Structures are given as structure tokens and as C-alpha cells.
Design a protein around this nucleic acid. Structure first.
Lengths: 493, 82, 159, 235
RNA sequence: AUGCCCCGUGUGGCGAAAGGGAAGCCGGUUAAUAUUCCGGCACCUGGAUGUGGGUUUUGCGCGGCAACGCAACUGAAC
RNA sequence: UUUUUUUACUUAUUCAAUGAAGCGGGGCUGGACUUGCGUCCAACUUCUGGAGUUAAGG
């Protein structure tokens, strides 16, 4: 029977704000952000914000109290404090002017700039974050997109170039596992870049690879948050690469030559020790020009099981015969704004389309200097009303637009009283089509009248929800009708 | 190739624009046969008739500050700076 | 290295854990050579380029490029991954049961008026004597006469 | 064009009209007792008359001459513990081989530090140059050193920073340092430094070392003093 | 949001079964307790979270000259 | 150089006030005298039992 205060119990204990969490954990905000990113802590939203904090806003972020306590028990805090103290000692030595002591303290400080590695050990962090290997495989899309992006991207103060090179080694080892196990199934080319979907141990993973060009760094971007995510994903990718190579039986890591990497063989530079998609392009030798992207074509052909692939020596090394005069080249992929009868000149778009469809499309449509068929995304699952470009417009079309198109193709009591007064004083098919259109109009009017009666019988909040659903469906049907109409225009052209 | 892909800027009409697309390099050169960033990197790597034009078109790279002549030690310096 | 999963014991997921929202799969629109019905007008291109940022519903415009060498890379490809980074740890995660029902399910089923006839359906008589608004009407209990009142102050009886 | 709906509303901070804006009140902060005590300690030492034996320590080396001295001293900084351990290990290797310690090692040349050691060197006339720290507390540990150096004929200089001298000798603080002997190539630099120290410091401070220090008044008291002097000059 | 900003007001505890104070009544029952048990019929405080209502597509309800009324009627610091 | 007298200074010491909030010296503006430009003296709120806070602006 003890009296209780209001703000003490319930959601107030269940949630705490980010300010209170930082003050409880005795941390700076960058350290708190790094810990949250590595541990997987995310804000969440309370049922009633006023119950938790009396002066609360839609802007403020609440956290789970057990998440904050678990961060408190995390042992990376002692490493953070030790590194802060060691940095203070290094600055003290540099100010006092002895460089030998500063270097001796730096070698304990274990800098990511000199190591090319994450500064802390995240192995146990990976262990609680992904308890099982299938969960680890499910969470790989963001990892692969991140590490391919930072393989492409320039280095900065937060992201060392040695660490970028280690990202490149890890992703190349992952690519060699993919082409060894043939684990890729889907490949897509888009204005975004190259989307790759691989099914590794029954889990579909799709990631984006940007095109080889100078990536724009305009605007405000924080590479420190990027660096934290990169360090986590490098640790995860290294461990999953080791497990995949151990499952395949190959030795990890694959030894890559520094001279070969300096030459630029990359996938050819990394060599792996022994200790229908394969049938597609199983026995064919393909040459690549300068304009063609050599490492995506080499990746997709090795994933499809191409035995030999060659390209220009300026593009890379560790390939087949770079000379086009060599008769061994069965096919050639070139996109230029010669004329060997043995060599079949075909498009990279044909390569993407063939690896998507497993059909080996004819090179006549994809001849150079000729317009190629439009490329299609394999990831799209068709649905009712979402519209399908592959589906015929005759197969899918609303009745009003169908009768309007039919009338356009054909073109390409009061009346009885007037007839009585007048007497006292192809085209039939078009008229029948107009009568069918009028019957459709009257049917739509009847349906609208029934809809209005039901809307009137609805209650107020149910009426508002019903109108919102009708508005959303009307927007979707409007976009679908616009797509169908301009597809009809393309068909007429 | 890493320097070209990382810090690549074009000097056109007294301006400093990045080499985001190969179409910009194609419009800049046009008649010399250089229409791609890969082609420009190849012409930089292997000396050709348009080497001087390619060097004039390519802006001087502004490397980040690291924290006699070298025969082969310049690669480590370039990796540390970029 | 060593693989972390020396011993894998199946652990039930806690109900408090909410997985991150997965990015949607790419559509037919995203391709560099899409079907031509996805392409917009130059008026739509100018509409976006006049429109403010984050007002547009979709972050990419339908673009068709003939050549891979003519394909330009995005100027915000770093930015979208940066936004994905910020959404992973900064955006709140909510478990919400979104309704997916037929809209006509909420509508009640009404009998047709043809079953419920007779009812008045068309105007058959007009009484015109009032220059002001007709305030009140009443019908004689015998059903013969009509009484009307108006703003003119005149009460009238009609057949 | 500007929106017509935006207008300026000035705030008049006169007496009794608006709430005063947040200004910098650092001049009037009620400080903690240790801060207040150290400030008043400095002020009291300024206000009282300082006898010449303490007031000689106000005059120190200038920046150029101090840097010129430190250019010589940094060549003769003593061995650190790691360098000493390496020297012991290398000499132990030679002794294990059987070679002589005279053969493997040579006479060291370092800056001499430690108060009793330096005082002994000055009395035995082995010191060539003596640098005495500005801010030794208690001051009695060094208050006799300029007079002892003048008695012994050793050139001397008072220099800012016992922490600066401790950084030379790999300590936190050194009260005094001495150069006794240098290598052959630095003998000319040492002689030039000693002559520069003489001409710059000692000739300048010979007149002012006998004078009493202190007597300086506060800012408001000083301003009252020029106001009364101006009134007297007008009268 | 590897830091920054805001505020002044101080300082804790004990001290009343007659002061202040959230909320329980009737009937019955024991050898002996009962506003405490039983039966019936209520109330207060604290918490979580739904449904139905209210508001909203022009965001934050209407009426009365008024005193004010109406089941709700956005409301952080100060 | 020392012994007495009074007569200035503030730092010892004593008293008081405050949430240690605007002290002192200049600068700007106005008014006075002066000398032909130095002083001193003032900037700001008075018919009303309302309100004054989260900076407007350049």
C-alpha cells in the first residue's frame, strides 16, 4: 500500500535517451557511436514518449536500458581508455622531444595506418552479433557493398591506403571463392552499377559494384563512421572467407604476388592452392577490349566456367594471348563508338543477358553498331498490377483502354420521336463498338453508385481510412495506366 | 591506375572538374583517339604521341599530407600519400 | 585465421531484436537499357530538376544509355551508402503490423433498391407562389392539401 | 526579394527596460581558493619590496640567447635509460669477447646537473658555464648561486624554465645545469656562447642586480597616481 | 552533437499513532478478532497496452451578448 | 645614519554587501564652463495593480 510516484516505473525504466546513455557509459559520442555500430545497438521508439521523458521530442532518440547495460559490460571500453592514455603518453613524448620513446610507444599503440587493420580485435563482437554461420551469410549485402566501395574509393585520414589494399585482397579472395564454387547465379547491369546475386549455402546475397571511375566526394560525408563500418565488415569478411575456403578445401589466404599486383593482374595475381551455369560458356575463348570492363567480364566468365579468357595487355596481365591475330579467340567483346571470321564480335550486354537467361542469345541482335534489346532485371518478381514489360499489352490491359484502342483502330425515346416527326414530315461495327463502350460506361456508373452508397454507410474513421486506401490505389493505377499508355505509343510507333 | 581512379580531375576552360564520366574526357580530347579514362590511363602508362596532350589535360594530383631521386621507392611514397 | 563457429548451438532469437529494413531489389527501371515505356518526358526531367531535393519519391530517374563507356557514374553513390550507414545505427527500428486487405472488405453489403421499392423517385409537382425561401411544408391528414410558409410572411394552402 | 513579413525588433538594454544580455563576466567570477591564493601570492610579491638577492632573478636571458645556449646543450644531453642499456649490452658483448672496456668505450661529454654536484663543480672551478633556473621554490636553494659564481669567477646566466632544464636532463625539473667540458669541434661554439652570455647578460645585469625589486602598485592605484600627478602638474 | 551549450538555488538527515495527509460500507460470523474473516456492493493509487470514440486532406473541436457550457479539445523550456 | 611630530600610499589587519553583474582607464554622443579645448557630468525606463523570458535584424 505504498504510494508511488509517476515518473519512476514502467517505460521510464525501460527506455533511456541517448544523452543519458552517454553520460551513464562515461563515453564520448564518437566512442559511443563506434560501440553501437559494432555491437549492433539501434535506437527503437517507445509507445509513449511523454511517459519516458517529460520533455521529449520527435527528434530525440531513446535506447533500450538492457542494451546500454550490455554495452557497459562490453570489454572494449578498457581498450578505449588504454588507447586514450597511450595517445596522451605519445603526445607527451613528442612534446618533450624524444622520438625514440614516441616510436616505442607507437608500436604498442598499434596504428591502423601502419598495420592496414582494424585497431581493436572484433572477433568476439562478430561472435555475439552472428551466433550462426547462416545468419552471417544472411548479413553480407551491406558488407560486400561497403568493401567494394572502399576498394574503389580514394584513401583519407580515417581510411588508410594499406587498409584499402587489405579490403581489395579480401574481396578478391571472396571473388575467387565465387568463381571456384560457381556460387553466383544472377548478374545485372544498371545505371547504379553491377548487381551480383550469389546463393552461398542456400542464402541469396545481392550486392552492388560501382563502375571504375572517379567517385565523387562532394558534399558532407563522415569517413569515421564509414571507417567504423569498414573495420567491422573487414573482420566479418575475413572470417567468412576463411570458413568458405576451408569448406571448399582450398588454402586460406590465397598467396598473391606483389609484383603481379603492381602489374595489375588482380584476380589473376591471386592464386589459390588446392589444399547449367557451369555449362553456359563452358568451352569458349573470349577476348576483351579496352572499353570492356575486364574484371567484371573475367569474374562472370570464370563464374560461368570459361576455361580461358584473354584481354589487352594494357588493361591487365596474367591472361591469354592479347593479340587479336591469334586464332584461338572464339569471341570478342568490344564496345567502340580485325574482322576475323573465327572471332564472333558480341556485346557485354549480350554477356549479361546470356548469364541471366542461360539461353546463349544469338549475336546477330548484339552485333557491334546495332541496337541491342533492352536489358532486364532478373531480381524482379512479377505481381498483379505491378505490370510486366515481358507481358503483352494485349494480354494485360484494362477494358476501357482496350475499347479505346479498338475504336481508334476502327477509325484508322427522343430519337424515336424525331424519326416519327421526320417520316411524318464497317460503320455498323464501329457503332456496335460504341454501344459496347456506352454499356461499359453505364456499368461503371452503376458500380460508382454502389460504391457511394457503401461509403455513405461507412462510419467516419472507417470512411477516412477507406478514402486513404482508395487514394493510394488510385496513385498506383495511375502510374500503371501511364506506363501502359506510353507502351501503346511505342507499339504504335 | 590507382592515382587516376582516385584523384582524376580535368582542366577544361580554366576549370577544375573531376573525371566522373568517360564522356567528359571524350569531349575534351575528341580527335586524338582518347575517349575513355582507361584509354587515358593506358596512354599515361605507355608513352605515346598524345602523352603531352594527356598530361596537359590531366590536372596535377593533390596528394594528402603523410603523417635524391628514387629508382623504385616512389611507389611507397605514392601509396602513403594517396 | 580460425573460424568462429567451432561449436554451433541453435539459439532462439530474442523478441526484442528487430532486423534492419532490407533495401528493395532493383527493378526494370534501374537498368541502363530499360524497356522504353519506363522513360520519362523532358518535361518530367525538367520537373525534377526544378523540384527540391527529398520532394521526389524515387531517388533515380529513368535513364537510357547506348554505350557502357557513355554510362556516367553517380555523383551521390558515396552519399547513398553514407545514408545507409546512418540508417543502420541512427534510424529507429519499429515492429509494425501494416494492413494488407482488400479496400472493399470494409464496405457493408446493401440490398438493391429494386427489392426495396416503392419509394419516390422523380419530382412531379412544383408549387410556385413564394418569392422568399419556403420555410415549412405540411400535408393535410386527409392527404389532399399542402400548407407552406415562407419569408414573405404568407402561409398558403395548395392542392 | 526579401519577405515583407520579416521586421527587426531592437532590444534596448538601458536601465530598467530589457533583460541584460549574457556578457562575459570572467572578471567577476568567484574563483576557488587555490586560484585566488596563487593570484594574490603573485600580487603580494609584486607589492612588497624585494631584496636584491631575490630581485636579481627577475632578469633572465632573452629568447635568442637562450635558444643559442640550448643549441649547444642539446648536443650534450645525457643518455636515456634505453640508450644506456644498449651501451651496457654492447660493452658486455665486447667483454664476453674479451676486449677491453677502454678499447670499446670512450670519455663521455654531458651536461652536468644536480644541485650539489653543480655547486661542487663551481667550487672546484671545473664548470665553464652555469645556467640557473628562474623559478626554484624554495628560492634559498639557488639564491646564493650568482654570488658563488661571481666569487669563483665562473660565468653564469639565469634562464627561464626548470622544466626546460629538466627536459634537457630527461627529468621533470632541474634547478641548475653546468657545462664543464665539450668536444673539440664545439669548443669554438662554447667560447662564443660564453662571450655572448657575458656581453648580453652580465654587463646588463651588473647595474640592476644590486637594486631592490617590488614596489609596483595595482592598476587602479597607478591610475590614481597619474591622475594626482596630472592635477599637481596643472596646479 | 574525442567536444559544446544552458541555469542558479542551494545543500544532508532525524523530529507529531492529537498537526498536514490517495482510497470501504452494510449485513453476518467466534469461546475469544474483526471498517482486517465470510457474503454482497464499492473505491483509490501506480503501471503496461488494445478497442471504440475525438481531431486532421486548409493541423490542432464547437456553442452563448455575457457570467459560462459541452465525452474529449496539441502543448517543451521558462 | 639614527630619535620625535604629522601626512600621504596599500599589500598586512579590521568592517560591510552580493547569485562576487557592470569597477577603473580610454573611445562615441550631448550639455556646460573654460581656455580658445582642458575639465566635470550626463547618457537608459514616471498618469495606469497588464505583459516583459527561447534574439529580431545587418
Amino acid at each position: 500500500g505504498k504510494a508511488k510516484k509517476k515518473g519512476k516505473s514502467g517505460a521510464a525504466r525501460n527506455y533511456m535517451t541517448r544523452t543519458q546513455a552517454v553520460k551513464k557509459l562515461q563515453l564520448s559520442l564518437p566512442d559511443f557511436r563506434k560501440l553501437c555500430i559494432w555491437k549492433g545497438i539501434y535506437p527503437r521508439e517507445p509507445r509513449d514518449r511523454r511517459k519516458v521523458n517529460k520533455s521529449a521530442t520527435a527528434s530525440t532518440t531513446f535506447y533500450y536500458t538492457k542494451d546500454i547495460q550490455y554495452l557497459l559490460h562490453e570489454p572494449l571500453l578498457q581498450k578505449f581508455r588504454e588507447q586514450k592514455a597511450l595517445e596522451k603518453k605519445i603526445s607527451r613524448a613528442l612534446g618533450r622531444g624524444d622520438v625514440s620513446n614516441a616510436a616505442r610507444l607507437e608500436r604498442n599503440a598499434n596504428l591502423p595506418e601502419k598495420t592496414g587493420k582494424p585497431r581493436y580485435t572484433l572477433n568476439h563482437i562478430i561472435r555475439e552479433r552472428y551466433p550462426t554461420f547462416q545468419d552471417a551469410l544472411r548479413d553480407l549485402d551491406d558488407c560486400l557493398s561497403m568493401l567494394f566501395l572502399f576498394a574503389n574509393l580514394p584513401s583519407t585520414t580515417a581510411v588508410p591506403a594499406k587498409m584499402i589494399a587489405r579490403c581489395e585482397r579480401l574481396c578478391h579472395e571472396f571473388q575467387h571463392y565465387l568463381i571456384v564454387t560457381h556460387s553466383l547465379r544472377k548478374s545485372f547491369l544498371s545505371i547504379k552499377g553491377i548487381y551480383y546475386q550469389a546463393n552461398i549455402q542456400g542464402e541469396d546475397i545481392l550486392w552492388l559494384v560501382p563502375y571504375k571511375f572517379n567517385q565523387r566526394i562532394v558534399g558532407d560525408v563522415d569517413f569515421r563512421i564509414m571507417g567504423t563500418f569498414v573495420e567491422f565488415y573487414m573482420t566479418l569478411l575475413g572470417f567468412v572467407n576463411y570458413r568458405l575456403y576451408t569448406s571448399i578445401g582450398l588454402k586460406y589466404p590465397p598467396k598473391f604476388d606483389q609484383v603481379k599486383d603492381d602489374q595489375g593482374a588482380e584476380l589473376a595475381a591471386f592464386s589459390l592452392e588446392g589444399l547449367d551455369p557451369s555449362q553456359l560458356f563452358a568451352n569458349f575463348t573470349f577476348f576483351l577490349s579496352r572499353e570492356t570492363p575486364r574484371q567484371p567480364l573475367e569474374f562472370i566468365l570464370r563464374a560461368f566456367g570459361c576455361k580461358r579468357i584473354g584481354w589487352d595487355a594494357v588493361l591487365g596481365e596474367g591472361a591469354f594471348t592479347t593479340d587479336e591475330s591469334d586464332p584461338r579467340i572464339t569471341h570478342q567483346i568490344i564496345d567502340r563508338p580485325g574482322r576475323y571470321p573465327g572471332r564472333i564480335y558480341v556485346q557485354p550486354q549480350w554477356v549479361w543477358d546470356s548469364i541471366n537467361d542461360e539461353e546463349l542469345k544469338p549475336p546477330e541482335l548484339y552485333a557491334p553498331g546495332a541496337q541491342l534489346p533492352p536489358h532486364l532485371s532478373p531480381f524482379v518478381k512479377p505481381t498483379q498490377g505491378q505490370y510486366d514489360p515481358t507481358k503483352p499489352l494485349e494480354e494485360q490491359q484494362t477494358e476501357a483502354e482496350a475499347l479505346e484502342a479498338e475504336l481508334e483502330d476502327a477509325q484508322a425515346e427522343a430519337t424515336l420521336e424525331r424519326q416519327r416527326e421526320l417520316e411524318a414530315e464497317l460503320d455498323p461495327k464501329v457503332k456496335a463498338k460504341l454501344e459496347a463502350k456506352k454499356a461499359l460506361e453505364r456499368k461503371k456508373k452503376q458500380e460508382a453508385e454502389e460504391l457511394e452508397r457503401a461509403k455513405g454507410m461507412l462510419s467516419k474513421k472507417k470512411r477516412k481510412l477507406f478514402e486513404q486506401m482508395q487514394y493510394s490505389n488510385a496513385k498506383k493505377n495511375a502510374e500503371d495506366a501511364k506506363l501502359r499508355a506510353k507502351r501503346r505509343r511505342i507499339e504504335k510507333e | 591506375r590507382e592515382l587516376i581512379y582516385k584523384r582524376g580531375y580535368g582542366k577544361v576552360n580554366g576549370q577544375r572538374i573531376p573525371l566522373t564520366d568517360n564522356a567528359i574526357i571524350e569531349e575534351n580530347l575528341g580527335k586524338y583517339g582518347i575517349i575513355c579514362i582507361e584509354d587515358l590511363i593506358h596512354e599515361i602508362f605507355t608513352v605515346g604521341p598524345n602523352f603531352k596532350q594527356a598530361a596537359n589535360f590531366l590536372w596535377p594530383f593533390k596528394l594528402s599530407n603523410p603523417n635524391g631521386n628514387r629508382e623504385e621507392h616512389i611507389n611507397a611514397l605514392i601509396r602513403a600519400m594517396n | 585465421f580460425y573460424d568462429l563457429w567451432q561449436n554451433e548451438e541453435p539459439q532462439p532469437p530474442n523478441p526484442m531484436h528487430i532486423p534492419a529494413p532490407k533495401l528493395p531489389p532493383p527493378g526494370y527501371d534501374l537498368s541502363y537499357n530499360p524497356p522504353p515505356e519506363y522513360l520519362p518526358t523532358k518535361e518530367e526531367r525538367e520537373e525534377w530538376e526544378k523540384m527540391d531535393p527529398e520532394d521526389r519519391e524515387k531517388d533515380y530517374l529513368p535513364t537510357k544509355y547506348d554505350s557502357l563507356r557513355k554510362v556516367p557514374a553517380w555523383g551521390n553513390f558515396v552519399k547513398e551508402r553514407f545514408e545507409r550507414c546512418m540508417d543502420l545505427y541512427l534510424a529507429p527500428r519499429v515492429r509494425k503490423n501494416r494492413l494488407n486487405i482488400d479496400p472493399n472488405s470494409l464496405l457493408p453489403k446493401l440490398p438493391s433498391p429494386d427489392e426495396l421499392k416503392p419509394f419516390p423517385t422523380v419530382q412531379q409537382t412544383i408549387f410556385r407562389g413564394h418569392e422568399g425561401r419556403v420555410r415549412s411544408v405540411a400535408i393535410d391528414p386527409t392527404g389532399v392539401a399542402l400548407a407552406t410558409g415562407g419569408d414573405d410572411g404568407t402561409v398558403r394552402v395548395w392542392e | 526579394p526579401k519577405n515583407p513579413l520579416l521586421e527587426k525588433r531592437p532590444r534596448n538594454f538601458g536601465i530598467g527596460q530589457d533583460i541584460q544580455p549574457k556578457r562575459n563576466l570572467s572578471r567577476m567570477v568567484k574563483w576557488p581558493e587555490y586560484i585566488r591564493l596563487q593570484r594574490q601570492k603573485k600580487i603580494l610579491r609584486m607589492r612588497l619590496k624585494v631584496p636584491p638577492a631575490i630581485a636579481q632573478f627577475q632578469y633572465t636571458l632573452d629568447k635568442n640567447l637562450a635558444a643559442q645556449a640550448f643549441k649547444l646543450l642539446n648536443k650534450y644531453r645525457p643518455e636515456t635509460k634505453q640508450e644506456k642499456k644498449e651501451r651496457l649490452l654492447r660493452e658486455a658483448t665486447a667483454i664476453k669477447e674479451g676486449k677491453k672496456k677502454e678499447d670499446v668505450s670512450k670519455k663521455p661529454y654531458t651536461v652536468k646537473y644536480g644541485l650539489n654536484h653543480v655547486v661542487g663543480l663551481i667550487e672546484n672551478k671545473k664548470a665553464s658555464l652555469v645556467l640557473i633556473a628562474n623559478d626554484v621554490d624554495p628560492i634559498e636553494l639557488v639564491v646564493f648561486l650568482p654570488a658563488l659564481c661571481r666569487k669563483m669567477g665562473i660565468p653564469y646566466a639565469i634562464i627561464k624554465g626548470k622544466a626546460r632544464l629538466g627536459t634537457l636532463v630527461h627529468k621533470k625539473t632541474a634547478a641548475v645545469v653546468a657545462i664543464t667540458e665539450v668536444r673539440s669541434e664545439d669548443k669554438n661554439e662554447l667560447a662564443k656562447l660564453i662571450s655572448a652570455v657575458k656581453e648580453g647578460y652580465l654587463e646588463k645585469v651588473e647595474d640592476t642586480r644590486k637594486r631592490w625589486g617590488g614596489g609596483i602598485m595595482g592598476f587602479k592605484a597607478q591610475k590614481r597616481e597619474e591622475k594626482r600627478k596630472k592635477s599637481l602638474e596643472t596646479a
